[PDB]
Amino acid sequence: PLSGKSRESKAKQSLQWEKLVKRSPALAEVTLDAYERTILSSIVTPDEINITFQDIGGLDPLISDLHESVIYPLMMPEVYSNSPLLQAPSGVLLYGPPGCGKTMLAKALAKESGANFISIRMSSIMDKWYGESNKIVDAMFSLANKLQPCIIFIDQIDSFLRERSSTDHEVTATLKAEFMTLWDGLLNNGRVMIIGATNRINDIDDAFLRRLPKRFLVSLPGSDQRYKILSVLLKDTKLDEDEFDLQLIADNTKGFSGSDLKELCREAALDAAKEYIKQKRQLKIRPLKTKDFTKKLRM
Amino acid sequence: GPLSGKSRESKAKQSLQWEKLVKRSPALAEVTLDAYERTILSSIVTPDEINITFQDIGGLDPLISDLHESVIYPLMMPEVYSNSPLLQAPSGVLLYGPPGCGKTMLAKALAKESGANFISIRMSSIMDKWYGESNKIVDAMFSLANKLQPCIIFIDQIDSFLRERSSTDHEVTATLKAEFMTLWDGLLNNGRVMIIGATNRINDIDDAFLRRLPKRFLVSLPGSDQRYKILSVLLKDTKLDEDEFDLQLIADNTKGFSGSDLKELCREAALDAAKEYIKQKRQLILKIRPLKTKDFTKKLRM
Amino acid sequence: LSGKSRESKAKQSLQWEKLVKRSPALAEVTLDAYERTILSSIVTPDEINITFQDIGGLDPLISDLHESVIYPLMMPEVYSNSPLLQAPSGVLLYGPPGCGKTMLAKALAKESGANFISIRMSSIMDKWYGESNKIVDAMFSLANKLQPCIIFIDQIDSFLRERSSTDHEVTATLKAEFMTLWDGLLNNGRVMIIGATNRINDIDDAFLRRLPKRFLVSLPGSDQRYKILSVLLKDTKLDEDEFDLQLIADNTKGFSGSDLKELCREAALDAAKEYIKQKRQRPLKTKDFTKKLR
Amino acid sequence: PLSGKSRESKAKQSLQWEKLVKRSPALAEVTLDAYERTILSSIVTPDEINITFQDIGGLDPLISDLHESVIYPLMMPEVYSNSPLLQAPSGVLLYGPPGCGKTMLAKALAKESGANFISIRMSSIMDKWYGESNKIVDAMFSLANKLQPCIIFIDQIDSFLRERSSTDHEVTATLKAEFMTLWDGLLNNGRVMIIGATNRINDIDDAFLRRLPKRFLVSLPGSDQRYKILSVLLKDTKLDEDEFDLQLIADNTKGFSGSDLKELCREAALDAAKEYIKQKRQLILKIRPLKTKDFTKKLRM
Amino acid sequence: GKSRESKAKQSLQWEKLVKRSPALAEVTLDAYERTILSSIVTPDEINITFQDIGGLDPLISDLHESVIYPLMMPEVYSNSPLLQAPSGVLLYGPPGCGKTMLAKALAKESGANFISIRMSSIMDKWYGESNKIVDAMFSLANKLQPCIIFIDQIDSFLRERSSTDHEVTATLKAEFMTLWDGLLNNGRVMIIGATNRINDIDDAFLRRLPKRFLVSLPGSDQRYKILSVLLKDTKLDEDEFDLQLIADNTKGFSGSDLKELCREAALDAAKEYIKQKRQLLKIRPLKTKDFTKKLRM
Amino acid sequence: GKSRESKAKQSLQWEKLVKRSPALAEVTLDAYERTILSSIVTPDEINITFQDIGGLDPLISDLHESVIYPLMMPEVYSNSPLLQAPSGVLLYGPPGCGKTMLAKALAKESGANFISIRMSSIMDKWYGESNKIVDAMFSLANKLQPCIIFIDQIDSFLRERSSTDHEVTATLKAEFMTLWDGLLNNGRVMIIGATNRINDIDDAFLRRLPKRFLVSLPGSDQRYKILSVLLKDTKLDEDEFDLQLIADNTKGFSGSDLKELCREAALDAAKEYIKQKRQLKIRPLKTKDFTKKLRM
Ligand SMILES: Nc1ncnc2c1ncn2[C@@H]1O[C@H](COP(=O)(O)OP(=O)(O)OP(=O)(O)O)[C@@H](O)[C@H]1O
Ligand SMILES: Nc1ncnc2c1ncn2[C@@H]1O[C@H](COP(=O)(O)OP(=O)(O)OP(=O)(O)O)[C@@H](O)[C@H]1O
Ligand SMILES: Nc1ncnc2c1ncn2[C@@H]1O[C@H](COP(=O)(O)OP(=O)(O)OP(=O)(O)O)[C@@H](O)[C@H]1O
Ligand SMILES: Nc1ncnc2c1ncn2[C@@H]1O[C@H](COP(=O)(O)OP(=O)(O)OP(=O)(O)O)[C@@H](O)[C@H]1O
Ligand SMILES: Nc1ncnc2c1ncn2[C@@H]1O[C@H](COP(=O)(O)OP(=O)(O)OP(=O)(O)O)[C@@H](O)[C@H]1O
Ligand SMILES: Nc1ncnc2c1ncn2[C@@H]1O[C@H](COP(=O)(O)OP(=O)(O)OP(=O)(O)O)[C@@H](O)[C@H]1O
Ligand SMILES: [Mg+2]
Ligand SMILES: [Mg+2]
Ligand SMILES: [Mg+2]
Ligand SMILES: [Mg+2]
Ligand SMILES: [Mg+2]
Ligand SMILES: [Mg+2]
Known part of the structure; x- marks a missing residue:
């Protein structure tokens, strides 16, 4: 193990395992090894994500495609058991320009999708002790197999x-080879699926990119997509009907990513x-106007 | 006395794999093992664990027949070939090529249909942080493959x-690889042990290891007829349209498609x-419509 | 790991005690070993002599930075009515060298009230495998533990x-880990990563999106040069009639704040030197500034 | 604890010891330590080897040089006792490209040469327990000195x-230092020679390379050498009297190592x-004599 | 292991056993069996009811249906030879959960004679004394026919x-394996074990413990039941106290952690009443707030 | 054990125990119990008051009201069964702080019989002797009913x-776990332990230590209080001496660092008075002595 030895890490692993058993009572009889228990600290429950698929704007066709080709084949195998071709992908890639909502879709998948989510970072795998990183990867795949509808998410x-x-470094090379072997090798994986988000799809290895067959292009939003982006972002605000012209705002944000639109919303808010902020600091928020955004917009 | 592989579930897996091996070959009941060989026993792949036969790989039929006649028959049927010393099975086999073209498929078919005991070894079973334990693991792997006399040590990647x-190179990794070369082809040669590997990057293999893999199978990208064969295999046990489905057009337009790309395309087409049947069943919780060439070519890029 | 050194352990203890004195709620907070090594990079107050009143010219940028960064971060009760009023996830200071970006970070460290972590590439790279990623993860977890926290990356x-x-493999995986913790599946707390840079095109686009608030600390305007000269020449004897800052500001063309500092230092x-010679054996005037001007 | 704790290891050690005493009756009186007993499992007898010096083709000058400079100075010291310079080397390095015949020569030294052979491996030397690896190396040298004409062969x-x-690890550093000390130190090894095989000679330490002073370069075969190697491999195999032309195959196999030629001969056979095995498998008469085309169809030409 | 206090304890336990079961009277005991008699646990020495263990009711029911009743009442199970008591029972799991609570309730409410043996009584410095002690342990357990041998940890x-391992430890383990399941099999003798490290147990010893109970960490409803049991006969506010909130917010808490939390909250x-009593009505009824001060959410 | 000096010390500690608690008379102890009796410490041997621990006043009060009073005054906490003393207490934190100081103050004036055991007493070479030593330690602690078993480090x-682990250490730990919380539970026996590495302790053992006190490095106010306590019964200047400056510049210092600083400053x-005495009063302490060694 050599990573779940700290008392805080053991507490985190017990919390995540208790949450997993609460969500899936059949997991009570499942026993884990020390390395799998080390992986348990990377399990991310829907309680940790405060983000729903409803908070995603401008990706409704992408969300429907992702659902009907990824979520339901993974989560409803009885429905898709008429043909063995109706299966979840062995991997899914969310590639696109930065700020367009790949990690948003990943958070929604952690929350809304029933699948257990392991979000794994490189720091939780790379161990300076010899041969520990390969055992960590093997136990990650073993744990994902034990929590049978599991999703392994690797951001970036x-x-x-x-x-x-x-x-390449030797340990990194053996890590990549072990991941390729367990991801698609002699021994099949039961409902285990790897999700990746990235900005540079070409940096991914060809043999690794082959293991990510279902690829979603989360590209820069269009005019309508920007309109839905703004509608989602300015939720729970004033948004006066007469003072606000959302369509002009959306068309004025040429080449604007979702993160940039969040920044614009934050600045305008x-x-x-600001006057109400000063009054509250000394001790209502005015309706949002197209003038504020246009002042913050380059136009 | 290895410090790894002594877990209770690991011991259960070793007992189960040994039971399967003894049931397959009753002569192995008298065979005794050391503890390190027992930890190697977890990597044994028994034909029930594989769902892939040689009939499930399309477009590699000349390669499959060549693999049979040059690898499987000289290894599994030595009495037929026991007339010349040059008719022996190769000490190693390399299935190299572009990704997704069917190397693991051939490994699965070798694990299932060949009848050789199969050890699929990954590096996490070999690397050990304790000193001189990876070398003992490798020595035990070769000793176990010699004990199960017709054996295949498969190392993917x-x-x-x-x-x-x-x-x-790391010290323990260097001595590990040197021990692997020594046991693979050295003094006291193995009986009927064959080491099969699968790579995407053949040029990354050491020249000495490559020499020890004399038989090389280039599982290259499929051609038009080969792609038709893969599409026909992948679309088996699935309702296909009559007098409307054009598999030849799909195979022709899938230029440069590996077998995995065709598998994904078939999955998306299904x-x-x-989708209408899926919605109807989800409402409950006709049948699947026959797959047309328009269904395949909608998402197929020309 | 750098935590083996006795001096490093002493520095970590001193920084931790300064943080606990600043925030008494940090007494119950426990830290990992890697977070303890990150504690050596923490810039607490009473170490920085730079105040927001020590920066001249960019006072509108100071007020904008306040109202958009410091108050949203340090006063969440005022801004808690709306979920769009939170502090930026990242803040960027960019422009030409010598324009006061480092002082802007220093005044933020002294005056904002958030815990300040000043990290560097030299203090983040480690010899062993996987230690750099664990160090970055500990940096982010520590900044989450010290809930109002500003992480500074100079250059x-x-x-x-x-x-x-x-790019090297270690550097690439370090940057990917930094991306994942900065904006990933697990939302950070009131953690803000700020950096000062001279070149804006060298920043990765996926890192530029993580710095939504960008402040252009550019070359000063003429009024900004006047404010800079007034701030720099404070508590200094100046002539009431002979000394005139107007033509000093007007003659300084294409001169940055570092260049104005150099001109002021030479003029002083x-x-x-005459005072030193008199000691061995006069207010500052404009003519001394104009002599060095070209 | 000590390595080699298996009962099969004890069986192997006792069998090898009985073989050694049968080969040389003088070794019966020699008692062994526990670590020397563990080293006994690495003893290689000529009955375990089926490769002689006649099975190695294209290396006749190298084989004769190896004999007259290594085997005869060691196995027949009476002849060489006239001069103190006429002595066996402290070590032998068989280095060269992979597949050229170094392990063939090691097998032939194990079989034909009368020296007791210790084919040691790193799995029988390295130990996780503290100080056991050094005692294993020391007992390897002690046993090699007891079985007085001995060859310690370390492949790779x-x-x-x-x-x-x-x-490097502390255990490996002290292991290498102990090997260096026993190989060439104060106390003198009588007739112990450490033969090594490698592909990367430059990876060997200079202080260890100087302990392997008799270096044999088993290089890539020439056309004459390739002809001899193919003739050796194709022995006891039916070949065509007229259509078969080995010289053309030898000329066309440029850059082919011995292993490449072995694989070529195996696939050619x-x-x-192929018609004979197909008939036999249908049943379950005569193998057709090998022709030039059989090697030509498997060659680049 | 002979001393005046130990001899008095042995005599007291023997009269307790004889008074409990008249058949156990007039039975000759060896000196080593007499020394083992000091480890006999009687029901009055245990203050834990089976009702004092909350959150394990399926485990309590399974234990009763598979362990206690087959051992204690063979007459009901006499019709089929396959309904015998287990040779051994293992109560494994993470520390904190009620393995010792289960063992205490077995010592009090199963009705079997209980031998809670420790390593001090078994291990002996002199030659061959520990094996004779284990032999006498099994002989005494056979003499008190419905006996439980409990070895904690x-x-x-x-x-x-x-x-x-030492020669004497290996001999002890082999002697225990021989008497546990060997020739001349035991009567209604069951060796109940409790442990945290099941993987540390020998394979043959695990084989001799067929019926294994996993006393895992409590879930939310199990925590609610444990908190309800620990707060029995304790005054709780009618409206302020919210036990479900405390159960849901004590994630990862074991039963011991809940006991310590309840003690600290009480x-x-x-505190105010205790200071008033020290310097001189009743304890204030417990609220949710008292537990949430100590809680880390 | 089994020595003349050892038996004399055991007898002396037994007379001290019977003198303090008259009900301990006519109580028979086994040979291993008599061996454990040499580790009994008494208030005479400890010359450290709870007042001699500065800065830890909230920790002192918490330790009192949650450990000492529930253990030594069970009549007050009698009505509610949940008001019992903890089965164990852990004092953990960086070295230098008052963990042993707290243990010494507990040994003096908590009123509990104290067993300050060390690993030389418990660990034995012979077979089964260490488990019997632990069993007798717990039997003696139960005999001296309000007992505290302190295991430093x-x-x-x-x-x-x-x-x-060695088989004897594993058996020793299992015996300690069994007696600490098992069948036939102890009476008013508490196992207090001090450490710097809480993460090294086993999860079951840490479970058996429910009450845990983090004796962390002193703050500025705590440093002032520790300096005031350490500089008691010594002469300090009325005008030149200011403790707040020394407490401010002793950043990151522990109590041990302050004790050494105070000793060096004294x-x-x-120095000149000592030189005069060696040739043959104490100069009042000023801030110059403390800030001279201080590196600020
Ligand atoms: N489709 C969307 N719907 C709603 N908000 C969005 C969407 N896309 C982006 N955003 C906003 O922009 C932010 C982008 O963050 P996110 O981590 O999802 O980006 P990304 O596309 O994964 O980029 P990167 O991979 O470079 O981190 C979101 O937190 C949200 O505030
Ligand atoms: N010739 C083929 N016939 C049928 N299916 C194929 C063929 N080639 C590949 N596939 C499909 O591709 C999937 C991946 O296995 P494959 O054997 O292609 O991996 P691979 O070729 O070893 O590539 P990598 O080295 O990247 O693992 C299989 O599930 C299989 O369905
Ligand atoms: N507004 C200002 N008021 C006073 N001095 C200033 C101002 N701006 C710049 N300076 C001077 O410029 C010098 C250069 O440091 P400064 O903080 O400006 O660097 P910077 O803008 O962060 O540049 P770089 O990225 O090259 O480090 C300072 O030492 C300071 O004297
Ligand atoms: N000179 C030769 N004559 C006949 N056969 C040869 C010759 N060299 C090699 N071979 C064939 O090649 C096979 C392997 O050769 P060998 O094991 O000696 O390689 P090597 O030179 O030791 O390289 P490495 O050090 O990589 O093992 C032998 O079994 C033999 O049949
Ligand atoms: N299921 C439970 N219901 C009620 N109280 C419990 C439960 N489990 C534990 N407790 C409380 O925790 C205390 C300790 O529990 P217990 O003695 O069973 O743990 P243990 O099995 O000895 O731990 P270990 O596994 O470390 O030996 C008991 O005094 C009891 O009050
Ligand atoms: N709170 C305090 N008030 C006064 N003096 C103190 C205090 N803490 C420590 N000291 C000084 O430290 C000395 C004892 O230190 P102590 O042994 O308690 O440290 P510790 O934390 O127990 O060390 P370790 O954990 O390494 O055993 C005493 O002589 C005392 O002068
Ligand atoms: Mg992202
Ligand atoms: Mg593959
Ligand atoms: Mg700067
Ligand atoms: Mg070789
Ligand atoms: Mg217990
Ligand atoms: Mg101490």
């Missing part, structure tokens, strides 16, 4: 699954409520 | 295990064609 | 370089 | 004797006889 | 056999 | 159990 997967080179 | 040795 | 162009094949030093 | 010796650095 | 006694709630 | 004794301030 381009670095994890980088094109193998002769200059801070500027519009 | 063997280009990482048998990578080009260098001065920057998901698209059955 | 953030090098730390957040655009990813390419020429040529006059103070 | 570039990993055992790799260039020492500050990054498989494809040439 | 049984992973230390039944640890995996190795060469590094102390904090009754 | 308890991380080593209660370390995480492993199969690579030596340097009394």
